[PDB]
Each structure stands twice: as C-alpha cells, then as structure tokens.
Amino acid sequence: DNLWVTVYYGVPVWKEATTTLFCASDAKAYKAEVHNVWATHACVPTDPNPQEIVLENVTENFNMWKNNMVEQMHEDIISLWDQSLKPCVKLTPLCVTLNCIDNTSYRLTSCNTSVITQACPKVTFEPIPIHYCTPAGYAILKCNGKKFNGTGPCTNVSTVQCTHGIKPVVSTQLLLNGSLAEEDIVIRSENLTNNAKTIIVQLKDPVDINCTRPNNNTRKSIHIGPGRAFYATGDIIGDIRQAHCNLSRAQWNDTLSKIVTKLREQFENKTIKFQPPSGGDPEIVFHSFNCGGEFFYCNTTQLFNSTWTNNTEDTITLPCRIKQIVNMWQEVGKAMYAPPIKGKIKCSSNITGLLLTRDGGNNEMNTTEIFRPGGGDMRDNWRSELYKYKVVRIEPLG
Amino acid sequence: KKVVLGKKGDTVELTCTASQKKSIQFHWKNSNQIKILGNQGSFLTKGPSKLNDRADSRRSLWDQGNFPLIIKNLKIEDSDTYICEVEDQKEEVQLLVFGLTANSDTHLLQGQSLTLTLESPPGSSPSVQCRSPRGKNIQGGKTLSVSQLELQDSGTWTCTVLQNQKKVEFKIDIVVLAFQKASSIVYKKEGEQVEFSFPLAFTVEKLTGSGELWWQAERASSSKSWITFDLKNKEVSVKRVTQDPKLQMGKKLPLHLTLPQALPQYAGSGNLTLALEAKTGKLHQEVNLVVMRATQLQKNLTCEVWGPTSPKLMLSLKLENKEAKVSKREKAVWVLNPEAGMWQCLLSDSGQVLLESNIKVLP
Amino acid sequence: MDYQVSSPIYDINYYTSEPCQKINVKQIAARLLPPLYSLVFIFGFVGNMLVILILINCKRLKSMTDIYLLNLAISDLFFLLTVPFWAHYAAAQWDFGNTMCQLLTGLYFIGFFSGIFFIILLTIDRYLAVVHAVFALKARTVTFGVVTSVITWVVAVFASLPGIIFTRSQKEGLHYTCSSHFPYSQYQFWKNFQTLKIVILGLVLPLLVMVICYSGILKTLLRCRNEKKRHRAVRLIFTIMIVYFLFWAPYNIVLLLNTFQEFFGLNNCSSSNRLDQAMQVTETLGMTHCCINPIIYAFVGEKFRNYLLVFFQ
Ligand SMILES: *[C@@H]1O[C@H](CO)[C@@H](O[C@@H]2O[C@H](CO)[C@@H](O[C@@H]3O[C@H](CO[C@H]4O[C@H](CO)[C@@H](O)[C@H](O)[C@@H]4O)[C@@H](O)[C@H](O[C@H]4O[C@H](CO)[C@@H](O)[C@H](O)[C@@H]4O[C@H]4O[C@H](CO)[C@@H](O)[C@H](O)[C@@H]4O)[C@@H]3O)[C@H](O)[C@H]2NC(C)=O)[C@H](O)[C@H]1NC(C)=O
Ligand SMILES: *[C@@H]1O[C@H](CO)[C@@H](O[C@@H]2O[C@H](CO)[C@@H](O[C@@H]3O[C@H](CO)[C@@H](O)[C@H](O)[C@@H]3O)[C@H](O)[C@H]2NC(C)=O)[C@H](O)[C@H]1NC(C)=O
Ligand SMILES: *[C@@H]1O[C@H](CO)[C@@H](O[C@@H]2O[C@H](CO)[C@@H](O[C@@H]3O[C@H](CO)[C@@H](O)[C@H](O)[C@@H]3O)[C@H](O)[C@H]2NC(C)=O)[C@H](O)[C@H]1NC(C)=O
Ligand SMILES: *[C@@H]1O[C@H](CO)[C@@H](O[C@@H]2O[C@H](CO)[C@@H](O)[C@H](O)[C@H]2NC(C)=O)[C@H](O)[C@H]1NC(C)=O
Ligand SMILES: *[C@@H]1O[C@H](CO)[C@@H](O[C@@H]2O[C@H](CO)[C@@H](O)[C@H](O)[C@H]2NC(C)=O)[C@H](O)[C@H]1NC(C)=O
Ligand SMILES: *[C@@H]1O[C@H](CO)[C@@H](O[C@@H]2O[C@H](CO)[C@@H](O)[C@H](O)[C@H]2NC(C)=O)[C@H](O)[C@H]1NC(C)=O
Ligand SMILES: *[C@@H]1O[C@H](CO)[C@@H](O[C@@H]2O[C@H](CO)[C@@H](O)[C@H](O)[C@H]2NC(C)=O)[C@H](O)[C@H]1NC(C)=O
Ligand SMILES: *[C@@H]1O[C@H](CO)[C@@H](O[C@@H]2O[C@H](CO)[C@@H](O)[C@H](O)[C@H]2NC(C)=O)[C@H](O)[C@H]1NC(C)=O
Ligand SMILES: *[C@@H]1O[C@H](CO)[C@@H](O)[C@H](O)[C@H]1NC(C)=O
Ligand SMILES: *[C@@H]1O[C@H](CO)[C@@H](O)[C@H](O)[C@H]1NC(C)=O
Ligand SMILES: *[C@@H]1O[C@H](CO)[C@@H](O)[C@H](O)[C@H]1NC(C)=O
Ligand SMILES: *[C@@H]1O[C@H](CO)[C@@H](O)[C@H](O)[C@H]1NC(C)=O
Ligand SMILES: *[C@@H]1O[C@H](CO)[C@@H](O)[C@H](O)[C@H]1NC(C)=O
Ligand SMILES: *[C@@H]1O[C@H](CO)[C@@H](O)[C@H](O)[C@H]1NC(C)=O
Numbered sequence A: 001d002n003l004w005v006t007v008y009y010g011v012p013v014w015k016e017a018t019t020t021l022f023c024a025s026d027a028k029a030y031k032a033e034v035h036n037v038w039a040t041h042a043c044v045p046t047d048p049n050p051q052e053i054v055l056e057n058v059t060e061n062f063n064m065w066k067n068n069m070v071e072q073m074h075e076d077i078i079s080l081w082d083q084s085l086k087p088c089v090k091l092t093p094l095c096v097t098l099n100c101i102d103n104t105s106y107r108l109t110s111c112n113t114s115v116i117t118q119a120c121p122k123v124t125f126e127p128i129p130i131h132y133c134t135p136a137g138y139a140i141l142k143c144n145g146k147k148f149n150g151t152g153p154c155t156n157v158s159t160v161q162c163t164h165g166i167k168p169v170v171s172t173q174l175l176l177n178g179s180l181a182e183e184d185i186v187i188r189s190e191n192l193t194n195n196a197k198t199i200i201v202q203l204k205d206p207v208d209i210n211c212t213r214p215n216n217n218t219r220k221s222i223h224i225g226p227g228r229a230f231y232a233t234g235d236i237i238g239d240i241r242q243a244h245c246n247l248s249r250a251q252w253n254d255t256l257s258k259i260v261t262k263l264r265e266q267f268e269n270k271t272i273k274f275q276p277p278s279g280g281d282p283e284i285v286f287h288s289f290n291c292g293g294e295f296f297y298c299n300t301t302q303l304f305n306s307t308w309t310n311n312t313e314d315t316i317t318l319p320c321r322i323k324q325i326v327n328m329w330q331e332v333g334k335a336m337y338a339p340p341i342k343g344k345i346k347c348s349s350n351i352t353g354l355l356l357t358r359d360g361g362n363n364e365m366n367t368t369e370i371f372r373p374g375g376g377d378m379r380d381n382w383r384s385e386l387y388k389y390k391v392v393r394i395e396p397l398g
Numbered sequence B: 001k002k003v004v005l006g007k008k009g010d011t012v013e014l015t016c017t018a019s020q021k022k023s024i025q026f027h028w029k030n031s032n033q034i035k036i037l038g039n040q041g042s043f044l045t046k047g048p049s050k051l052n053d054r055a056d057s058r059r060s061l062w063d064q065g066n067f068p069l070i071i072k073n074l075k076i077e078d079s080d081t082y083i084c085e086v087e088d089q090k091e092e093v094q095l096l097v098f099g100l101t102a103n104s105d106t107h108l109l110q111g112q113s114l115t116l117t118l119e120s121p122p123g124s125s126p127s128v129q130c131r132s133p134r135g136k137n138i139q140g141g142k143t144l145s146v147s148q149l150e151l152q153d154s155g156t157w158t159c160t161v162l163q164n165q166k167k168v169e170f171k172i173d174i175v176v177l178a179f180q181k182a183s184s185i186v187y188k189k190e191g192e193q194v195e196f197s198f199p200l201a202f203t204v205e206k207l208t209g210s211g212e213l214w215w216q217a218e219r220a221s222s223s224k225s226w227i228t229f230d231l232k233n234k235e236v237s238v239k240r241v242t243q244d245p246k247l248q249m250g251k252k253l254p255l256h257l258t259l260p261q262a263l264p265q266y267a268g269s270g271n272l273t274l275a276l277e278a279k280t281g282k283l284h285q286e287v288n289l290v291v292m293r294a295t296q297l298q299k300n301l302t303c304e305v306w307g308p309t310s311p312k313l314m315l316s317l318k319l320e321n322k323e324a325k326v327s328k329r330e331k332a333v334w335v336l337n338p339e340a341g342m343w344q345c346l347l348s349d350s351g352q353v354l355l356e357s358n359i360k361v362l363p
Numbered sequence C: 001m002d003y004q005v006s007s008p009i010y011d012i013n014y015y016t017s018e019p020c021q022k023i024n025v026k027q028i029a030a031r032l033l034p035p036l037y038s039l040v041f042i043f044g045f046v047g048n049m050l051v052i053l054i055l056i057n058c059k060r061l062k063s064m065t066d067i068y069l070l071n072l073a074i075s076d077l078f079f080l081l082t083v084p085f086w087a088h089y090a091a092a093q094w095d096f097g098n099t100m101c102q103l104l105t106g107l108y109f110i111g112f113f114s115g116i117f118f119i120i121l122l123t124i125d126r127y128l129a130v131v132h133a134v135f136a137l138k139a140r141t142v143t144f145g146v147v148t149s150v151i152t153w154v155v156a157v158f159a160s161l162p163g164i165i166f167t168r169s170q171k172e173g174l175h176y177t178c179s180s181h182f183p184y185s186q187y188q189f190w191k192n193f194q195t196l197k198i199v200i201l202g203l204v205l206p207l208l209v210m211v212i213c214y215s216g217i218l219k220t221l222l223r224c225r226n227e228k229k230r231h232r233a234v235r236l237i238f239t240i241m242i243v244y245f246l247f248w249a250p251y252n253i254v255l256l257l258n259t260f261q262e263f264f265g266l267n268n269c270s271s272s273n274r275l276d277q278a279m280q281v282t283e284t285l286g287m288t289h290c291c292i293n294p295i296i297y298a299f300v301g302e303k304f305r306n307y308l309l310v311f312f313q
C-alpha cells in the first residue's frame, strides 16, 4: 500500500519538473483480463481520499503541446502492448549507417528486416481508468476554466495529487471512452491557419455507438438425410471478418451542428465543408479501434461527406472489417495476428472527442474550409486527456 | 536551396535533414501550401494534392533522420518547389522536369531532314547541348533541326541540357532506312547482259512501298520510259510498267534490275526513286550504264562508245601484239587499213582500263 | 528493405486450440456417386417393375403376404424416384428450388420408413402363419391386409412429418442447399429428437421383432422336419430381414455417432475426420438396398424364379 502526506500551506516559486510518476488504478488481480494483470504487477490501488487545494489568486501559462508528461504515458502504454497482444510475426525494420563525404551523396539503402516469431493466444481486452500520481517532492496543478483555450493561461488554478480517470483506449478519427467537456464543445489546436497541427474537438454530449458482428457465420440448419456428410452442421457460410456499427442520427446531428458554430466564430464566416480523407494508410483512411483482439477497421465515408451552410437544425450502417495484418502505431513495421474467435463481440462504446485536420491553401480562392478526419499520432490522443494537468516541482525551505 | 532534374517518367528523390533522431513529425508542402505527405505518429498520410497515387516515402529511414520524397511518373506540370518541415524549420528544395522527343518514328531515310521536339517547362531557360558519335556537339536554342540524317548518323545520341550547372543525359531513337550507294556506273559492251543491284537493310512494317526508276537515254529525247514496282513484305512484285526495255525484276528485296542485251540506245543516266509511308518520304539514287559497240563495217573497222562518258577519258584500238594504233579523246574513233589479230578496244579513266572488247580481222 | 509480408489469402476457420484441416471429400465422392446411383436407378427401376408385373398378373395377390410384397416394391419406388435427383446433387448442386423440396425429402423418408414397416408386417404375417395357425387364418383376410397397409402408409407419412416443418433453401456455402432449418429457440431438443427416430424405428424395432418372431418360428424346426415347404418359405422372409440389416445397420450405428461427438463417444477431430468418410459410405450402402429385393426374389424365392435355380445349376 502507498501513502503520501499533504501540504497545509505552500505557495513558493514554481519550476517545471520532469520527474517519474507512478500509476494508480483500481485493479482486480483475479481475472484473466490483461489490464488487470498489468495493473497488478505495476500499479497501486487508487487514493480513497483525494484532496484538491484550491488556489484563490494564482495564474500560470499551461502550455500543452510541449508537455513532457504525455511523453511518459506514451512510453507506458507501449510497455503494455508488448505484454497484451503478442504478434505471430513482428516484422520491424533495422538500418545501421550509410553516408558519404549533406555535401556528399546521401544514398542509404542498407536496411535489415528482422522478424520475431511468438505464440499468439487470443486474450481478453478491456481498458481500465488509471490515475497518474506525483512522486515525493513534486505537485500537479490543474486549471478549472471551462474553456482553457489550449495553451492559454487560466485563473482558477487548483493543485491535486492524482489525475482523474484516464483510459488507455487506442483509436483514430474518433476519440473513444474518456472525459467530456464541461459546458460547451471546445476546439483545441497548437496553431490555426497553418494546416499541419491536428485540431482536437472535445464534445459535451456522449454520442453512443454499438459495434457488433452477427453470429450467422456458422450454420444451424441440418440437412438430416441424403447429405449430412459434406455440408454437415457448424460449417462456416459467412464472412468471419465482417461487422457493422450504428450511430443515432437524431442525436449525432445535434453535436455536429455545434462544431460548425464554433468554426464560424473562429474562422470568420466561411463555408464548412467536411470531406473523406485524402488517402494513406488503412489505419488513417478508416476508423480503427480494438475489442478483444478484433481490430475493427470501420469505413466512415458515410459520416463526413456532408457539406454545410447556415440555418442548421436513425441507424447509420457503418461497415467495418477485421484485418489480421495490422500496422503497429508503436515503431515502423507490421504485426500479423491470429484468426478471430468464436462468439458475439459487442463494443458498447462512447464518443467523447473528435480529431480533425485542415486543408488551407492560397491556390484555392478566398473562401473554403475542408476538415478531413485525421489522427493516428497516439501522442495527440492523450494530449486531449492530459490538458488540465502539469507537473511542477516546489522546493521546500525545510 | 538545391535543384535536381527529372527525365519524364522516372522517380526522383527529395530528402530532408533531421539531426534529432526521434522520429518527429514531418510535412511536405509546395509553394502553394498544399499537403502531399506528412507524419502521423508512425503512419503515412497522403495529402490532398494532384500527386495522390504518385508520392511515396521510405518508412525504414524514418528512425534515422532522412525523409525522402519519391514521386513516380514525373510530368511537366509537376515542376514546383517544395519546403520541408522538421523541428520548426523550412528546408526549401526545388524541382524541374522536362522532356525531349522526335516525331518521325522509323521513316528516317538516308538524306532526310531531322526534326526535334523539346518539351521544356515554362519559367525556365534550357540550353540544348547534344553529343554525336561523329563529333557533332551541336549547341543552340531550344528547338534544333538538322538537314542531314543518313545511315552513318543513327544511334542513341546523348543530348544533355545545361541549366544552373546541372545536366542529365538522354537518348534518341533513330531508325535509318537508307540505300548503300549514291551512284552506280555499270560498264558493259554490246551483247553482254546488264545487271543492276541496289540493296536495303531488312525493315519490316505494314503496307508501305511503291516506287519507280526514271531513265534518260543518250540522244533519245523520247522520255517517259520507266519501270514502276510495288513493295509489300519479303517479296518483290511489279505492278505494271511496259515499254521498249525488257526489264525483268526479281521477286526478292535484293532488287535485280536486269537488262537482256546492252543495246547502244539503252545507255544514259537515270534516277531510282523509292517511297515508303506511315511517315511519307522519298529516297533517290543515280543509275548509269555505258555501252561499247565494236563491229567492223567492211575490211576496215570502226568502234564507238555510248553512255555518260567523261571528258577526261581515253580510247584506244590495238592489235594486242604491238602498241596502240590510234589514241584519241572522243567517243567515235575509227581505224582504216587494219591487220590480222584479235583487236582490243580500251576505255579507261586516268590509269585503269574500264571496258574491253575483242574483235578479229580475217586478212 | 526486403520485407516478406504481402499475402491477400485468408482462411475461413475460427480460432481454436487444435487446428483441424477437414477435407471436403465432395469431389472424390462426386466422381463415384453419380454413376453408381444411376446404376442403382437402372437396376432398381426395371427390378421392381418386374416384381409388380409378376405379382399383379402371374401370382394374383391371393393372400396377405403378396399384398405386403406389392407395397414393399411400391415403397422402394418412392425411394427410387428421388435417386436421380441425389445422383445429380453430388455431381453439382440443388437446382430444384424448395417448393418441391418439402415433397422430395418426405418421399425419401416415406420410401425409407414404410420400407422397414412392411418387412415387419411380412415377418408378423409369416410368424402368425407358423405358430398361431388358428388365429392367423381368421385374421389373414386380404381385406384386412389392405386396411393394415393403408394405416401403414399414413404412419409412414407421419413418421416424416416433423421433417416437413421447414424445408426453406437459401444460398449458404458454394451453392443453394435445402437444409431443414428447424426452430432455434428449442434447438437442442429437435436435434436429438431425430437420431432416435431413425434408429428406434429402423433398427431397434425390427430387431425386437426378429428376436421375438424368429424364436417362435425356430421352435417348429426343433419339433419336426416333416414339411420342407414350410421351412423353405421362412427362408424368403428371413433373408429380406437380414439383408436389410446388412445394408442399413452400419448407417444407423454411424448416425448415432454423428450427433454424439461429445463426452458420450469420441471427441478428437481426427476421429471425426475418419467419421466424415464413414457416414457417406454407409449412406451409399443404404442407397443401394432398393434394387436388392428383386435380386433376392430371383435367388431365394422358390415361387418366382424357382425354375431358374434348377436351370442355373
Ligand atoms: C468503452 O467502454 C465501454 C463500457 O461502457 C466498453 O464496452 C464494454 O466492452 C467489453 C469488452 O468487450 C465488454 O465485455 C464483454 O462483455 C460480454 C457480454 O457481457 C454481457 O453479459 C451478460 C449476459 O449477456 C449481460 O447481462 C451483460 O450486461 C453484458 O452485456 C462478455 O460475454 C465478454 O466476455 C467474453 O469475451 C472475453 C473476450 O473475448 C472473454 O475473455 C470472456 O471469457 C468471455 O468469453 C466468452 O465468450 C467469447 C465470445 O467470443 C468466447 O470466445 C469465449 O470462449 C467465452 O465463451 C466481455 O466481458 C462489455 O460488455 C462492454 N460493456 C457493455 C455495457 O456492453 C467498450 O469496449 C470500450 N471501448 C473500447 C474500445 O474498449
Ligand atoms: C474554481 O474551481 C473550484 C474547484 O473546486 C470551483 O469550486 C466548485 O464549484 C462547483 C460549482 O461551480 C461546486 O459544485 C457544487 O457543489 C455543491 C456542494 O458540494 C453541490 O451542492 C452542488 O450541487 C454543486 O455540485 C463544487 O463543489 C466546488 N468545489 C469544491 C471543492 O467545493 C469554483 O466554483 C471555481 N470558480 C469559478 C469562478 O469557476
Ligand atoms: C448475416 O450475415 C450477412 C453477411 O454475412 C449480413 O448480410 C448483409 O446485410 C447488409 C445490410 O443488412 C447488406 O448490405 C446491403 O447490401 C445490398 C446488396 O449489396 C445493398 O444494395 C445495400 O445498399 C446494402 O449495402 C450486405 O450486402 C449483406 N451481406 C450479404 C453477403 O448479403 C446480415 O446482416 C447478417 N444477419 C444479421 C441478422 O445481421
Ligand atoms: C487564447 O489563445 C490565443 C492564441 O493561442 C490568444 O491570442 C493571442 O493573445 C495574445 C495575448 O493574450 C496576443 O498578444 C496575441 O496577438 C493573440 N494572438 C491571436 C492570433 O489572437 C488568446 O489571447 C487566448 N485567450 C485567452 C483568454 O487567453
Ligand atoms: C502559426 O503559423 C503561422 C504560419 O502559417 C505563423 O505566421 C507567421 O508569423 C511570422 C512571425 O509572426 C511571420 O513572419 C510570417 O509571415 C507568418 N506567416 C504567415 C503565413 O502569416 C504564426 O506566427 C504561427 N503562430 C504561432 C502561435 O506559432
Ligand atoms: C443496426 O442497424 C441495422 C440496420 O437497420 C439493424 O438491422 C435491422 O434490425 C431490425 C431489428 O430491430 C430488423 O427487423 C431489420 O430487418 C434489420 N435490418 C436489416 C437490413 O437487416 C440492427 O438491428 C441495428 N442494430 C442495433 C443494435 O441497433
Ligand atoms: C446502443 O446500445 C445501447 C445499450 O445497449 C442503447 O442504449 C439504450 O437504448 C434504449 C432504447 O434504444 C433505451 O431505452 C435505454 O435507456 C438505453 N440505455 C442506455 C444505457 O443508454 C442504445 O440505444 C444503442 N444505440 C443504437 C444506435 O442502437
Ligand atoms: C457512455 O455514455 C453514457 C451516456 O448515458 C454514460 O452513462 C452515464 O454516465 C454517467 C457518468 O458516469 C453516469 O453518472 C450515469 O449514471 C450513466 N448513465 C447510465 C444510464 O448508466 C456512460 O457512462 C458512458 N461511458 C463511459 C465509459 O463513460
Ligand atoms: C484574492 O483576490 C480577491 C479579489 O476579489 C481578494 O478579495 C482576496 O483578498 C485575494 N486573496 C488574498 C489571499 O489576498
Ligand atoms: C540482420 O538481422 C539478423 C536478425 O536480427 C541478424 O542476425 C543479422 O546480423 C543482421 N545483419 C545485419 C547486417 O545487420
Ligand atoms: C461575420 O460574423 C459576425 C458574427 O458576429 C458578424 O458580426 C459579421 O458581420 C460577419 N461578417 C460577414 C462579412 O458576414
Ligand atoms: C456525398 O453526397 C452527395 C450528395 O449530397 C453525393 O452527390 C456524393 O456522391 C456523395 N459523396 C460520395 C463520395 O459518394
Ligand atoms: C444565411 O441565411 C440567410 C437567411 O437566413 C440567407 O439570406 C443567406 O444567403 C445565408 N447565407 C448563405 C451563405 O447562403
Ligand atoms: C440534420 O441537420 C441538418 C442541418 O441542416 C438538417 O437539415 C436535417 O434535417 C437534420 N436531420 C435530422 C434527422 O435532424
């Protein structure tokens, strides 16, 4: 068990610290769930009595895209995927050194393809909310402003000892399970009008999504009689790598109608035109989430086609497809997996955020706004969660 | 910034520099600020441009510090400058593509004019600097045209373009359809069978060929005697040409313009015109024939030479035991009071006997 | 620089802890079944029509046994009229839709179930004739033979009536198949409810008849040997029963094993991969039985082709 002591009163000079934090999640330590196994060997139980000391008159410049704390979580989830889904073939590139003598030719074609073969057991998979807690001597601040602007200074700074519920869910084009906005859908981006930084859009209302596969692959009709030998029962008849999702159109249309109102105020009365993405990797062109080793690659072309104009006011069939050979977001290379499993898999998920890029240009005339879906950089996935916090070290005179 | 060159279709390598070695985010934008490629974690995002199915990048080099830009099927309109974006920096690069070709594919006969077609991008000043195996480093503007193109000027010519101290090499496809002679002269005597032969060099194509041989007889102004023949595949067939010369032509591409007996009126100049198509054009070649007529009129003899004779030649009539009984520079020399012997007539040209004809006198 | 991951091929198989590559065994069987089934249909059609011509006009069906022999040949014809369809079903697929599939499936089992039902009636008629000779004479009226047969056909229809509950055919697998899709909600009940009905009615019940009836008949053989023709008549009915058992009981045993691959029997997939080559052979052996009963009549039967037995020897 762990234990730390409070600070009754301290307002000294603040200095940005880069110390090593310890996780703290509510595990179980008995099930065969992987996140319960990982939290048992490296995490501690959650704080039963948290304390948030509110600072009346205190301000600070919370820069968020230069936060070194999200660089630690990104190196703590890569340590979980090497203990959760062991790939059958882990193909990764490996080059060494080839240069000539910038002034001399830079033809580097020496690269080795190292392959690793491991056992592939299909294991359970479900995220668990964790709490990152500060070590001895440091403190974690937290703004309470309902807008917070991204890298802008707030005024309602309060200090804590552990963060809120953070799930390690890995997804693209739609931020899954996590925290919601307070009062209004806000947008966050490091720099607008430079069309390189992704725009994080956080929602204030949870849009639900149900992703399941129908159990009709195996046949239940019996040809009891002349046949019953070749076409015998339990024979696969359907595609075992096909699924479908559903989105409540009457509820999702409200939340998207609030996103375009924020853009109009920000970008001075333009024609918001959403579009499908411009191509690339199948983890970028399509949606990508995980449910028990089932890596749903959901076609979202019937989700971002619609163009917009002013005066704005049921079951969208989202076609998904399970692909075995997937790209690894952690490092260059691929990872071939195992065949899918026997039974109904249901992903009764949430939608809390939205990752959007921007297509600006000067060849195109004065007014257009193209917002293609982006994401894929998993550091940007948890910058949408660790935006309120900051690790600062306060020296003690004692 | 540096500059590279394209070769109208191949790939080009445009690299950036990064000394951080952390696989940080990169981008690829033109002068019009249009995304083409970009880093997304460890993933590749083909940006919204006109180079979607063309731009490529080597992912194995991303953990080194070098980020290439591989663009296949280089067109002329793709010439633009591209800036990099790593560690908040703008590594500006430049790119230029151009091309060069001809218009006549295979019908480049011996003595046919040459035409080029340079495809240079707008906003640039190229300079044609070719290289020929005959030592012709012909330099000029952008469009180059040469009147001379023969069988000895075929081959892949190395034409390079110097611009901003950069140059790349190219090749030129030349198919030369030529003859192997400018002017043949055949020296025969009265009675001897005359043979003509003018070769070509194994070109295979569709319906292409038809031509004719014009003739100018000596002192016979009655023109319009020729022979017209058609060409289609391995095979030679006369269409129809009719007239005083019994010209028989062979059935194979080594054309044998055969003439039965060298009659004295069958001598003079001539032009052989061959015409192929798919790219029309006409070849030309000179044909000549010289006829000697040695026949005694009575107990005194007289010999004459017909044909395109030179004003420098000689003529001699000797009884082959002693020396020449007469030597003149004409075409009709006579000998009165000959003797017994095998009389020889000598046609020559500054050193060397061309024609020889034997005849006997009975006393 | 040279990565070897480029393969679009996939396998239609679930993930288990024992990979079992089960071979389809349809093509090898499709080059053996259509000529065999056609040969069965050739011999079976001309075989049974002769047994129908002879009894109707040469024998005169003057007795209850001849009536059951007629109906047994008719039951074989109902089996036979489906044989060319199954011949053209291993070879390619099911081209006949489904509206006719609720009839053809029924006609298959009407041929099957009534087939053993009249053989049992043949056994009981000969059992009554030998032991209860007073009782048999009162009840062996040809009139009573007809009404017994009519009931026997009705029961044979009802014995296939659960199979006609659902015969819907949809494209599952390579080509449309007509596999009965009985209700999913009570799925475990109906599946076990079908294995027993073939085994009890087709194997257990005639075995129980054979034990009971042929113990009373063999008692006559122990007492005296005075009448050869009584002993020779039992040889006909006895042969029909055992040739039915030689050709159908291997299927009945395997059919129990087909459903019971659980703890009751064998659980290995390789045990079910030899079993995949066992069910089709014993079903094929059962298919050949419909032409054997006229062949038995030309060898055992001393009333139909008795002069051929002397002429052959
Ligand atoms: C965002 O957050 C949401 C939470 O709101 C989360 O949804 C939850 O996802 C998990 C992960 O799939 C779900 O957990 C599964 O639930 C099913 C169904 O549980 C139901 O149980 C009863 C009976 O129906 C209901 O009353 C009840 O309400 C539940 O709905 C379980 O069956 C699953 O367990 C099986 O699968 C595991 C992994 O395959 C096995 O390890 C486990 O042993 C079970 O295996 C059995 O079935 C397999 C079927 O293939 C078979 O292969 C095995 O051999 C064995 O027979 C599993 O626990 C949970 O239900 C979801 N929550 C809700 C409310 O539905 C999202 O997933 C999350 N987003 C992301 C991206 O993670
Ligand atoms: C600055 O941040 C602090 C963070 O604590 C804010 O204090 C919190 O204010 C909310 C209301 O805005 C309080 O919620 C209310 O609490 C009462 C009593 O618990 C409850 O009955 C209400 O239903 C409601 O939930 C919250 O308790 C309070 N936090 C604490 C620790 O007391 C403060 O309001 C912020 N100031 C500004 C100007 O935004
Ligand atoms: C049982 O599994 C099958 C497939 O394994 C599922 O069928 C699929 O259903 C969707 C919609 O219900 C079909 O999409 C539609 O296809 C038609 C024809 O191409 C098109 O015109 C429509 O616009 C729509 O896209 C899909 O094609 C179909 N798949 C097949 C192979 O037929 C079925 O949904 C599963 N059962 C249950 C209860 O879910
Ligand atoms: C929200 O953030 C934006 C930029 O991220 C801030 O805009 C800048 O504000 C400073 C002073 O605060 C000015 O000097 C700059 O000229 C502003 N730049 C632009 C592009 O507007 C904005 O002030 C922030 N809002 C709050 C309330 O802090
Ligand atoms: C966001 O990016 C833009 C570029 O798209 C930056 O604007 C440049 O600012 C510098 C100095 O202020 C000027 O010299 C450039 O001419 C500007 N470029 C353009 C296109 O306007 C802007 O400063 C960036 N903002 C932040 C906060 O980083
Ligand atoms: C997801 O959407 C599909 C498409 O409507 C739903 O499928 C229908 O389900 C109803 C049952 O409520 C059936 O009566 C329809 O026939 C189905 N349609 C088709 C085309 O098959 C599906 O039920 C939805 N799933 C959820 C969980 O809402
Ligand atoms: C996705 O699934 C959830 C839960 O299975 C559905 O949520 C329920 O929806 C019904 C009516 O559809 C409501 O009466 C319940 O109160 C809901 N429960 C919860 C916990 O939300 C949801 O409707 C499904 N979405 C779609 C589009 O089918
Ligand atoms: C997904 O969205 C649903 C929307 O109803 C969430 O359900 C509510 O969540 C709040 C927050 O904890 C609870 O106080 C409510 O009691 C929940 N409602 C019901 C009917 O249970 C749900 O929690 C969201 N999922 C996650 C993982 O946050
Ligand atoms: C904080 O600011 C408020 C202004 O409303 C003031 O009343 C209060 O005294 C300040 N707090 C301290 C500790 O000075
Ligand atoms: C290539 O990779 C293999 C496997 O990791 C290794 O054994 C070998 O030494 C490597 N070769 C080079 C040149 O790096
Ligand atoms: C842009 O929108 C603002 C909203 O406050 C409005 O005041 C302004 O007039 C609009 N400008 C144009 C050109 O429509
Ligand atoms: C998007 O919708 C429009 C109609 O609103 C349609 O014309 C267009 O084809 C759709 N986009 C795609 C990619 O099909
Ligand atoms: C916005 O709405 C007004 C009326 O509500 C309309 O006149 C105007 O044209 C609309 N704007 C655009 C860009 O269509
Ligand atoms: C969705 O929003 C658009 C915005 O103009 C509106 O026209 C449409 O009617 C909305 N659909 C539903 C089902 O509310």
Ligand SMILES: *[C@@H]1O[C@H](CO)[C@@H](O)[C@H](O)[C@H]1NC(C)=O
Residues within 6 Å of the ligand: A365, A366
């Ligand atoms: C865009 O703005 C420029 C400068 O204000 C103007 O010259 C041009 O006409 C505008 N474009 C259109 C389509 O009106």
